[PDB]
Amino acid sequence: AESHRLYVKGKHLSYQRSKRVNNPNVSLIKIEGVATPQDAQFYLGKRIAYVYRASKEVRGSKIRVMWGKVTRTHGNSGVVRATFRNNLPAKTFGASVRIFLYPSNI
């Protein structure tokens, strides 16, 4: 067809933070479509990929991926907490990111 998307779009909002101290080890993700923790409970444990590009070709590609997963819900509005192998570079606040449907329970 014309669409081939097998993931859900999301936005990298910020790190986990207090009013004046942030914590880069936990990122905050807005998954689009979900507006409550009860709907966000479907997406727990799903893999997340941040997909970006670079000028230098490394192993056949100019596209590099950072992997992570959803761990828990955050707040009352469907924001989730996500942890990555290496933390997200904080210039990606507001950048798009992919939530895959695996590991599936359905």
Binding site: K11, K30, E32, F93, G94
Partner: protein
Amino acid sequence: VEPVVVIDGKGHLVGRLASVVAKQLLNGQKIVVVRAEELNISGEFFRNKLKYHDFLRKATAFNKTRGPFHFRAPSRIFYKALRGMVSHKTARGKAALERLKVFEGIPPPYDKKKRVVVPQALRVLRLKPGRKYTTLGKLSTSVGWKYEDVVAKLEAKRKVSSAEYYAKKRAFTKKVASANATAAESDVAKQLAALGY
């Protein structure tokens, strides 16, 4: 959900719209706000004129050129109210603010596009009926904006052209609705009705 969101600023409250839009830019949504001369501020016109005069008094004493700049256009008043809510002195704030452009009227890039509203910042949905409000264009031309009438003339011309568009669109959609109704009650129509479409 959208590449660019075009917001019709008519009938909106300045602070509530700015707090919606600033969070949208910080989340990464591109926003363009049109018809900035029709924003509303709650309160009497005399109260908001006194507020702007209190703001207009404030300037750097030893050199007025480096002081706070008092911008007079309604779009720049909205930009001031929004820059107050974005942390504009950082690179993240600058990158957020470059996703925004605010206009008086609807310019020709955006007069053929779709305008939306923000229902949690609409005056008729927020204020109690009976409270007094202002028009940002009237306040801005009271404090020194020079282009209130040329925007009105351009908006009259644009509305005439848009009504000429809408008459043809209404005639076409009435033809399409007539054909859909006559091509209904067939077997595919009843199967789609059983399946929910």
